[PDB]
Symmetry: none
Subunit: 34 residues, 20 copies
């Protein structure tokens, strides 16, 4: 068998966000000018 | 068998974010000018 | 004056979590045995 | 004056969580045994 | 004046988490035995 | 058998972010001029 | 004036986490035995 | 058998980010001019 | 004036974590025995 | 059998980032001119 | 074993107040003008 | 073993106050003008 | 073993206050003008 | 005329005790032996 | 006229005790032996 | 006229105690032997 | 073994305050103008 | 006129105690032997 | 073994304050103008 | 007129104690033998 604990389980303060799951891609081109 | 604990489990303060999971790719070309 | 862009603004995929803000402290003593 | 953009504004996919704000503390002692 | 860009702005894939902000302290003594 | 503890488990303050997982690639060409 | 770009801005893959900010201290004494 | 502890487990302050995992490649050509 | 680029900006793969900022101290005495 | 402790486990302050894992390659040609 | 006496036990006149216990924080900005 | 006496025990006149315990932080910016 | 007496125990007149314990930090910027 | 503010007025956290007022005296001879 | 502010007024954290007022005297002879 | 601010007013953390006021005297002869 | 007496124990008049304990840091920038 | 600021006003961390005021005297003869 | 007496123990008049303990740091930039 | 700032005002960390005020005298003859 196999046994686990993953993530931030039993953490004292989970204040930051958690990672998501992307099964795919992302096309990105920010456009910043000033 | 196999047994584990992973991540930030039982951490005193999980303030930073957690890594996500990308199964794919990302095309990127930032465009910055001033 | 002063002008900025901070964080993961305009990111192509913000999949990981973001850092929080603690103004204080955290007392911690994990107790693990097997 | 001062002008800003913060956070994950204009992000292509905000999938991970965002950091919170604690003005205080957290006492923690996980208790794990097996 | 002063002008900036900080963080992982315009990144192609922000998959890892971001650093938080602690204004304080953390007392820690992990207890591990097996 | 095999037994482990990985990551920042039982850390006193996980303030920095955690590494994600990319199973793929990233094409990148920043464009900066001023 | 002064002008900057800091952090992992415009990075092709920010997979590792980012450094946080502690304004304080951390007391630590891991206790490991087997 | 085999037994381990890896990463920054039981660290007093994990403020820096953690290394991710890329199973692939990255094509990169920064373009900077001023 | 003064102008800069710092950090791992425009890097092809920021897989390792980034250094944090401690304005303070850390008391440490690991206790390992087997 | 075999038994280990690796990484920055039980460190007093893990402020710097941690090395990632690339199973692949990186093509790079920075382009800087001023 | 361990044995103690703490506080102002057996004092001849406990006229001043005693210190409390805050497990948290306090945000403060007095506003005084005349 | 270990044995102690702490504080102002057996004092002839505890007229001043006693130190408290903050496990956290305090943000402060007095604002005084006249 | 170890044996102690600490603080202002058995003092003839504890008129001044006693030091507290902060496990954390304090951000401060007094603002005084006239 | 005369105008004042005294004590810990407008304090962000009055956790320690306050000094009392003795108009008199205190005779004291602690007797400790072990 | 005359105008004042005294004590720990507007302090961010008054954790230590405050001085009292004795108008008199204190006779003291601690007796410690072991 | 005359105008003042005294003590630890507007301090960021008054953790130590404050001086009292004795209008009188103190006779003292500690007796320590072991 | 080890044996001690610390602090202002058995003092004839503890009129001044006592040092506290900060396990952390303090950011400070007084702002005074007239 | 005359205008002042005295003491540890606006200090970033008043951790040590403050001087008291004795208007009188103190007779002292410690007696230590071992 | 080892045996001690430290601090201002058995002092005839502890009127000045006592040194505290900072395990950390302090950032400071007073701003005074007139 | 006359204008001043005295003491450790606006100090970044007042950790040591402050001088008191004795208007009188002190008779002293420590007696130490071993």
């Amino acid at each position: 068998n196999l046994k686990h604990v993953a993530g931030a389980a039993a953490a004292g303060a989970v204040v930051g966000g958690l990672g998501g799951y992307m099964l795919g891609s992302a096309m990105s081109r920010p456009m910043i000018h000033f």
